[PDB]
Amino acid sequence: LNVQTVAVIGSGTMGAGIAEVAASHGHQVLLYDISAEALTRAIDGIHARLNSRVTRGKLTAETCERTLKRLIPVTDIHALAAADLVIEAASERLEVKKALFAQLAEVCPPQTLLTTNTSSISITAIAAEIKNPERVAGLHFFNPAPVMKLVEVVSGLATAAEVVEQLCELTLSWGKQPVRCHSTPGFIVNRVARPYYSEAWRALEEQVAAPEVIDAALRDGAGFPMGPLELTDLIGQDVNFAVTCSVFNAFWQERRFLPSLVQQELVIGGRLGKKSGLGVYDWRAEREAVVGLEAVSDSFSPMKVEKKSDGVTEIDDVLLIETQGETAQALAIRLARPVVVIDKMAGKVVTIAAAAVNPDSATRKAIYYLQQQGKTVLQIADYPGMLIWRTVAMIINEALDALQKGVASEQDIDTAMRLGVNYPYGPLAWGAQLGWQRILRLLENLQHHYGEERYRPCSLLRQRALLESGYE
Amino acid sequence: NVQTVAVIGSGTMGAGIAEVAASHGHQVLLYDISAEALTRAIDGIHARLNSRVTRGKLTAETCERTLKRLIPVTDIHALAAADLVIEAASERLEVKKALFAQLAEVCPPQTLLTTNTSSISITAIAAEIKNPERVAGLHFFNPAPVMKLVEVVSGLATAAEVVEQLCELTLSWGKQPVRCHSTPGFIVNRVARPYYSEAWRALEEQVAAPEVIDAALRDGAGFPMGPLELTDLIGQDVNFAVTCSVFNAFWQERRFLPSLVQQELVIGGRLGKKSGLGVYDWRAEREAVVGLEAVSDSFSPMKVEKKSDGVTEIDDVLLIETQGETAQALAIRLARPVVVIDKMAGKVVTIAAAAVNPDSATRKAIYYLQQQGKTVLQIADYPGMLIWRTVAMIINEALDALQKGVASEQDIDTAMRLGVNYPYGPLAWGAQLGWQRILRLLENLQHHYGEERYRPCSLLRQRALLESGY
Amino acid sequence: NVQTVAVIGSGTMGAGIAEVAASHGHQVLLYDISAEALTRAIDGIHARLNSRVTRGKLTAETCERTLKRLIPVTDIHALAAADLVIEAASERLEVKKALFAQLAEVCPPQTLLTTNTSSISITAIAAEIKNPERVAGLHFFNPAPVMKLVEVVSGLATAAEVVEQLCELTLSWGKQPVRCHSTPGFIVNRVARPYYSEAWRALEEQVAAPEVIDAALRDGAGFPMGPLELTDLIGQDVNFAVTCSVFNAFWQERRFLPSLVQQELVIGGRLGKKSGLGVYDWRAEREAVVGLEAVSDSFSPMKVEKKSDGVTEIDDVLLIETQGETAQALAIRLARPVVVIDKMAGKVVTIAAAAVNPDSATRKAIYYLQQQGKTVLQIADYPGMLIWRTVAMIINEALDALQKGVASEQDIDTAMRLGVNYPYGPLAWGAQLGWQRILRLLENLQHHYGEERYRPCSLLRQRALLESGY
Ligand SMILES: [Cl-]
Ligand SMILES: [Cl-]
Ligand SMILES: [Cl-]
DSSP states (O other): OOOOOEEEEOOSHHHHHHHHHHHTTTOOEEEEOSOHHHHHHHHHHHHHHHHHHHHTTSSOHHHHHHHHHTEEEEOOGGGGGGOSEEEEOSOOSHHHHHHHHHHHHHHSOTTSEEEEOOSSSOHHHHSSSSSSGGGEEEEEOOSSTTTOOEEEEEEOTTOOHHHHHHHHHHHHHTTOEEEEEESOTTTTHHHHTHHHHHHHHHHHHTTSSOHHHHHHIIIIISOOSSOHHHHHHHHOHHHHHHHHHHHHHHTTSOGGGOOOHHHHHHHHTTOOBGGGTBSSSBSSSOOOOOOOOOOOOGGGOOSOEEEOSSSEEEETTEEEEEOSSOOHHHHHHHHTSOEEEEEOOSSSEEEEEEOTTSOHHHHHHHHHHHHTTTOEEEEOOOOTTTTHHHHHHHHHHHHHHHHHTTSSOHHHHHHHHHHHSOOSSOHHHHHHHHOHHHHHHHHHHHHHHHOOGGGOOOHHHHHHHHHHHHHO | OOOOEEEEOOSHHHHHHHHHHHTTTOOEEEEOSOHHHHHHHHHHHHHHHTTTTTTTSSOHHHHHHHHTTEEEEOOSGGGGGOSEEEEOSOOOHHHHHHHHHHHHHHSOTTOEEEEOOSSSOHHHHTTTSSOGGGEEEEEEOSSTTTOOEEEEEEOSSOOHHHHHHHHHHHHHTTOEEEEEESOTTTTHHHHTHHHHHHHHHHHHTTOSOHHHHHHHIIIIIOOSSOHHHHHHHHOHHHHHHHHHHHHHHTTSOGGGOOOHHHHHHHHTTOOBGGGTBSSSBTTSOOOOOOOOOOOOGGGOOSOEEEOSSSEEEETTEEEEEOSSSOHHHHHHHHTSOEEEEEOOSSSEEEEEEOTTSOHHHHHHHHHHHHTTTOEEEEOOOOTTTTHHHHHHHHHHHHHHHHHTTSSOHHHHHHHHHHHSOOSSOHHHHHHHHOHHHHHHHHHHHHHHHOOGGGOOOHHHHHHHHHHTTO | OOOOEEEEOOSHHHHHHHHHHHHTTOOEEEEOSOHHHHHHHHHHHHHHHHTTTTTTSSOHHHHHHHHHTEEEEOOGGGGGGOSEEEEOOOOOHHHHHHHHHHHHHHSOTTOEEEEOOSSSOHHHHTTTSSSGGGEEEEEEOSSTTTOOEEEEEEOSSOOHHHHHHHHHHHHHTTOEEEEEESOTTTTHHHHTHHHHHHHHHHHHTTOSOHHHHHHHIIIIIOOSSOHHHHHHHHOHHHHHHHHHHHHHHTTSOGGGOOOHHHHHHHHTTOOBGGGTBSSSBSSSOOOOOOOOOOOOGGGOOSOEEEOSTTEEEETTEEEEEOSSSOHHHHHHHHTSOEEEEEOOSSSEEEEEEOTTSOHHHHHHHHHHHHTTTOEEEEOOOOTTTTHHHHHHHHHHHHHHHHHTTSSOHHHHHHHHHHHSOOSSOHHHHHHHHOHHHHHHHHHHHHHHHOOGGGOOOHHHHHHHHHHTOO
């Protein structure tokens, strides 16, 4: 590895942020754009952000000043002939990039690495007509580049393995964490994250719960840093929907990547979230706190509580059953007893559903029991698989499918989800913890209930459930 | 409070709408770009109102006063007097956006702006215009004077008072309105898809001649017209374009899948009645549906006994009401001759014999049916047959509409009763036919075909579980 | 009686079709608008037929006699004498519709008007054409003089008299006609899809190297060429395009899904033999697959006993022919080591070890097979494996085309034998392999993958129930 001079193409948020990372680590950076005004603004931004870090003592004055000196604005594409690495982050349109990379093939030596920050375009299609296709690769950073640790190092069909190793070593040296993946739709992060959003839209379309309740279960129950619906409001409905539709279409309309009419409606209505003041939520009025059910009195206490195995607690005559994807109602008529279905992980927020056939006294016994264990009990509709378990199962299923299709290694899939979108466990590590047979049973029940190919357990999930029963 | 009504576009539906508005007291400001097409359309209304005066439904005094309320215009700035605008122009996304942005400042701030669209989102149109809450869908059915239903379609911003206003207006026009949100196919065009689509599938697999399919749905199930003759009257191009529109708008959801058999009729210009040819030859006389000849009194059964689960045994044979399994599947399993029956209230009955039946065994089943005064049409051994399969799918679709918050249960039933003249509303019809019965049929079809198309929706499962507890 | 023949088009298929008609005693009006291309087409026919007079495959008297019958023309009005027109021009639907309209005025009402199109509907072409009942498809395969199959394609208007004429005519050209309706992929391009698609799926999951996949199908199943090397020879772009075309025309039916793997090669310009690299490196010679090495006689079986057919007990181990369940699934359900085998008639066999197997147990099974004289290829524990999975899907696809009335059983079988040179016609093959076996395998794959793609079609369930009698 001998990457010295780095060229960054584009003066937007990503280009400027990528330039900052490269220059802050000792590289001469050629920041290229055709507009000299644009370059000046982008460079003023970097100046301003780094100077405020020195103010707060988060960066030395020396490293600040040495960083700024390495940022060289250029308007002539020929100046990039000196670069060992070009990182492109300008127009997302395919034909523009193809034209850009064709131009860089003649300008630069054939040993210069030519990379793109794109999230949406095939590397293979970028690298298709250009001179030495083997040194074309994806180097995919996340907003904001100076803060986010993850980069996806993306191989196109032609991408050499030495090029991947060089790019991994270099981003390691920039204090990043590279993960490798092939040029398949959504890479790792945009692909595996999809059911986090789409399970919520489905819940929302069926009025299972208020959006605040869905977000509270996922954040304060499952441990995600932000609920999926609020996160779509903060990403911007237009942006998140465009990613969904893109992955959906690039997989020739796979129903596990189906878009939502609820989301579509918000986009075409211009209700894009925080940025426009209204989305799923109103961003003018400040955020309310989800309460949970008031304490049931000590007089409503159960006479006999018996924790059985397989997520069953028997409370007098009430079965409190952790969701396997069957409704409280189906269980209650099968077993001729009242049933409360619970959806819980480690967090304090817990969702529950009572079978319609429950007398309210039986439901209250179960609510009391839970409250006396520290949990905030939120009541929702009797929805198969509920919220937390339904969403995490589908996230894990998608991670497993990506692993099976050779998108990336198991460890790189876990890392990507931990760093790119801050999931509290990588999905594969999460599945091992939660139990493969348990995830399998749930998805099979969902698949049966809905009769949708969307809820199919993937072949590697069945494979891992079978291995797990082998150790049992 | 609406006085003057603007009706934009001079099409078939635009003319029928203007007639409804006029004959209920409203002064109608009819718009088009072509001034020659204006007088063309009004004289169409003149021609149609000269035959309803001859019957005695309207006197010639009120007839003339109706015709004098229709005022043709060609300038769009002059419509500032209209309290209500009803768009029925071209079905293009930019045709509507430009018109409504213009009508933001031409029309008053509180003037209700509606559209008769079958296929464009209301939210899409109301996006970049000034006052969003007064924009809606007012969806009439062909022909607008005769069909009693309008769908009042909310966009995302449409206010509930506006919804109420347009409901109050259509009520006053002899119509019965229904509320739905802006989702593909609204209520009527969505819930009715299986009526046609199942018939197309039957045809493709040559289950029966088209007349047999139409007779089964008409004089068996109780529909005013069979789905195939209906598509010939609607026009193949029109019905096929709605099927595709709904299919594409749900991102290719396979229970809305189009049919190659219909596509061939369209691309070959066989558009139905209007072109003289579609499914049927409309340039010739129609031979009525036969029904098998009666069998002799010597072929009479000895023993007849009704059993539980829609089975009646007749000698060594079994006449089984269809649960979605084939007669052949039932005959090899139960090791006895089986004939499967597809029937509701009407005289017309379809049947299938298991290929393993001796002809004598089948004739006994035909005889018993004939001795109940029923026309017996024999078709292929087809999972779910014709009537039960179709109605089960219509009901499934109705339940998914309800589940997804498109409209209320009573409104959905009203929509199918008045938008397409179904004998009962599907949700009421499901309760009468039995939810467990509907569920078990669709599961058997889901098993037989392995298609997501035939998936019981979640709400059906829920209601079947509730029914099992009564 | 057909005498004069008009061919329109001067490319590969245009030349070929002209060559066929000329050599069988027909005056051939070769049409193009260009005169430079017309000469270059005749030069190619002259080059090919003269390289066969020198190679002792044709006589000079017959060669010169054939090459005289080739009359190049640029005026479309010159085609008025033609008893039959065969079109093979540009595949845009507009240009074809415009040319065929022109032709009807120039030629008599009884002149047969045909096209060599693989992907455009005959009913669309015949829509606004005088006397449309004499319009059909005449679909030849590259290379036209070599390939024995012709698909004779009915539009909705195509007459039964015209079909007979074209069948009798093509028969007289030393060809074999098959009759089918105008539906996507006709017979051959539709039924052949899973041959390619299963291979791509195996590659995406890294089940085995591409050579191994190709050797299983060629030397184990008896296909003349394995699917992957065949796509390299067809051209990755051409094969992908047909896959996509069929997929889209069936409104995105999952049975016809394209592959990201093949897409990546097309997009990356690795189009196969024609550009030096596709799936395989054609710039270097390729070794045959070895197969596993001889296991020593120390792992000799204590006792060999054929258990219930499909299942063979070897002491510790069970050798189980694939029925769609993984070696691992069986291993833990039978509480015994399992080796799954995927075999038909050729020497080449694929096997998969269950992960729970001790390596000595697996070797016992390997030894046992090697001593039967078979090449053993070890691959991943893949549901349905390669041969049986592929053939079952080809059989399922042929059954679907049969029940949708695309073509008769014998014609489907004939079309696969002569169009793509398959060792057996799929429908005959399926009876020989047994319907219930094919049924059970597809059901096991459908359950495993939860995909509509692996659904048994309706006709397959019917034939499996029929097979359980006798
Ligand atoms: Cl996103
Ligand atoms: Cl319609
Ligand atoms: Cl091909």
